[PDB]
Amino acid sequence: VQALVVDNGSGNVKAGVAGDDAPRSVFPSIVGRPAFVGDEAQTKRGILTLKYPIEQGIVTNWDDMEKIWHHTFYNELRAAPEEHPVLLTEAPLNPKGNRERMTQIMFESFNVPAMYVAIQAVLSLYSSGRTTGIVLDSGDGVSHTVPIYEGYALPHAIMRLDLAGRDLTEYLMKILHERGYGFSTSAEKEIVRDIKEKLCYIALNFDEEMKTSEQSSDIEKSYELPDGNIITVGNERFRCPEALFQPSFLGKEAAGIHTTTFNSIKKCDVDIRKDLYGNIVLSGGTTMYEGIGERLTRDITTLAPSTMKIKVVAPPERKYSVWIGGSILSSLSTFQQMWITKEEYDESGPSIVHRK
Amino acid sequence: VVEHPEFLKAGKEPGLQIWRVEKFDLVPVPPNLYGDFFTGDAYVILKTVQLRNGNLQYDLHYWLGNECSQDESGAAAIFTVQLDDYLNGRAVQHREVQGFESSTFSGYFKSGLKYKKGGVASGF
Numbered sequence: 353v354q355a356l357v358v359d360n361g362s363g364n365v366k367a368g369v370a371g372d373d374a375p376r377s378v379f380p381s382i383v384g385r386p387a388f389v390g391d392e393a394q395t396k397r398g399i400l401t402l403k404y405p406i407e408q409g410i411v412t413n414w415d416d417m418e419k420i421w422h423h424t425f426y427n428e429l430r431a432a433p434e435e436h437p438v439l440l441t442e443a444p445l446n447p448k449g450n451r452e453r454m455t456q457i458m459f460e461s462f463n464v465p466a467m468y469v470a471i472q473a474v475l476s477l478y479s480s481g482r483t484t485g486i487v488l489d490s491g492d493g494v495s496h497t498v499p500i501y502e503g504y505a506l507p508h509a510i511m512r513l514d515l516a517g518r519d520l521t522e523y524l525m526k527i528l529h530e531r532g533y534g535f536s537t538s539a540e541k542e543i544v545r546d547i548k549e550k551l552c553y554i555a556l557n558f559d560e561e562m563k564t565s566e567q568s569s570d571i572e573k574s575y576e577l578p579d580g581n582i583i584t585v586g587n588e589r590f591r592c593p594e595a596l597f598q599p600s601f602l603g604k605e606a607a608g609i610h611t612t613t614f615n616s617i618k619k620c621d622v623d624i625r626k627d628l629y630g631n632i633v634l635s636g637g638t639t640m641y642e643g644i645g646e647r648l649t650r651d652i653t654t655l656a657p658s659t660m661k662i663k664v665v666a667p668p669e670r671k672y673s674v675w676i677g678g679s680i681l682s683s684l685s686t687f688q689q690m691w692i693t694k695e696e697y698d699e700s701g702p703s704i705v706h707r708k
Numbered sequence: 709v710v711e712h713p714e715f716l717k718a719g720k721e722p723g724l725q726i727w728r729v730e731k732f733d734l735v736p737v738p739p740n741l742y743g744d745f746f747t748g749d750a751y752v753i754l755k756t757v758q759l760r761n762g763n764l765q766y767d768l769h770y771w772l773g774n775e776c777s778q779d780e781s782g783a784a785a786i787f788t789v790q791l792d793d794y795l796n797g798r799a800v801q802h803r804e805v806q807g808f809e810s811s812t813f814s815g816y817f818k819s820g821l822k823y824k825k826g827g828v829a830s831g832f
């Protein structure tokens with residue numbers, strides 16, 4: 353019997369079957385009302401007011417979240433939840449009561465036979481073929497740095513960053529306005545998101561790149577809009593992702609990702625830091641910028657002691673590493689013994705989820 | 709506690725035990741092929757040593773071939789964590805990459821580490 357794997361993202365839901373190499377269903381985590389779910393709601397942005405049930409990785413609107421899960425099972429996968437185990441993902445440091453609430457909905461509303469809740473960052477490390485390392489996960493809503501040693505995350509060293517892809521899209525939109533283009537609406541927000549993914553990159557040295565880009569026109573690139581018009585983008589290509597390293601660009605007091613990663617490793621016992629510096633694993637869609645590995649290696653090497661060897665790992669398929677890791681875990685011969693059964697829930701209630 | 713018939717045999721006496729990841733399961737390697745590794749596969753290795761007092765010491769290695777698929781290397785890592793837990797966390801875990809193995813791991817095989825082309829098909 354094949355389990356279903358569902359990764360609950362702030363931007364997108366990734367859903368599919370255990371044993372596949374990639375999710376078969378990816379759609380936006382949106383619910384619109386004049387109820388439409390996913391892409392249905394994004395095409396109809398006029399009559400509908402859109403709501404995001406997941407905020408910075410945490411479920412905040414349970415009614416709408418149940419509508420998203422219904423859409424996942426029936427409209428997207430065409431699967432009877434009563435006949436498949438379900439593996440669900442959660443963000444690091446997810447509130448305890450929300451893990452229980454998610455468990456109650458699965459057994460009482462969808463009547464699943466068994467389920468399991470896994471931490472997103474740990475799934476990503478397993479997908480890279482590792483048991484020890486530090487995962488930098490940055491998606492649409494939130495970024496985290498999660499040290500993991502011999503299979504288990506270290507909660508005292510997990511650090512959170514209020515800066516991710518959605519903040520970067522709004523920044524590119526603002527500086528393209530300063531450039532002379534008039535992107536503003538929610539629909540245009542989706543086009544600027546495509547520009548970001550297609551033309552942006554991370555400079556190895558920001559200050560030098562600013563002078564390089566002005567001394568020639570090789571920085572410029574053209575982008576065709578859906579209507580057919582063409583625009584040109586210059587130094588906004590590397591200024592936008594730079595906010596990951598200098599959050600002040602966005603009016604935030606937070607430290608950049610390189611400083612955050614460094615502070616996370618310092619919170620760990622000195623005897624394991626070498627294994628952490630040598631296994632910095634990137635995960636999530638916002639780590640997909642060209643040049644990110646080389647910039648991250650330079651900045652962390654500048655902060656870390658010289659006796660440590662810094663190695664940043666950038667898997668080509670890291671945009672879905674969380675889901676891939678769940679697909680592998682839930683396929684193992686030993687997984688039958690790891691999950692919560694409908695029997696155990698009927699006797700213990702939703703609290704059984706924590707000792708499992 | 710998670711188990712598996714191969715878990716019941718592991719670390720009961722001093723010696724060397726090698727398993728191969730085969731479509732999301734852990735399968736023992738025939739004893740005479742120990743030391744020959746398919747470049748397309750991943751393996752789990754447990755070295756057990758007896759101590760002066762009489763207690764046992766555990767070293768867990770997961771070896772990854774240059775051509776092994778993502779499902780096999782990911783499964784090898786998870787099985788390694790699960791076997792360590794079954795041993796009450798007493799084992800030390802080591803990641804070994806084809807061609808860059810630690811001196812300790814290479815030293816388990818007096819005839820030397822050898823590689824073969826091919827392997828078992830992926831679970832994906």
Ligand SMILES: Nc1ncnc2c1ncn2[C@@H]1O[C@H](COP(=O)(O)OP(=O)(O)OP(=O)(O)O)[C@@H](O)[C@H]1O
Pocket residue numbers: 360361362363364365408409490491492493494495516517518545548549550635636637638639640641671
């Ligand atoms: N090639 C790319 N370059 C840069 N950013 C990208 C690229 N591809 C996707 N993104 C951004 O990655 C983000 C989505 O990644 P992800 O799908 O990992 O978010 P999530 O997992 O849905 O959110 P969270 O995990 O924080 O809840 C979006 O903001 C998207 O714009």
Ligand SMILES: [Ca+2]
Pocket residue numbers: 748749750775776777780826827828829830
């Ligand atoms: Ca193989």
Ligand SMILES: [Ca+2]
Pocket residue numbers: 502792797798799800801
């Ligand atoms: Ca251990």
Ligand SMILES: [K+]
Pocket residue numbers: 409489490491492493494495496636
């Ligand atoms: K994230």
Ligand SMILES: [Mg+2]
Pocket residue numbers: 360361362472491492636674
């Ligand atoms: Mg995510």
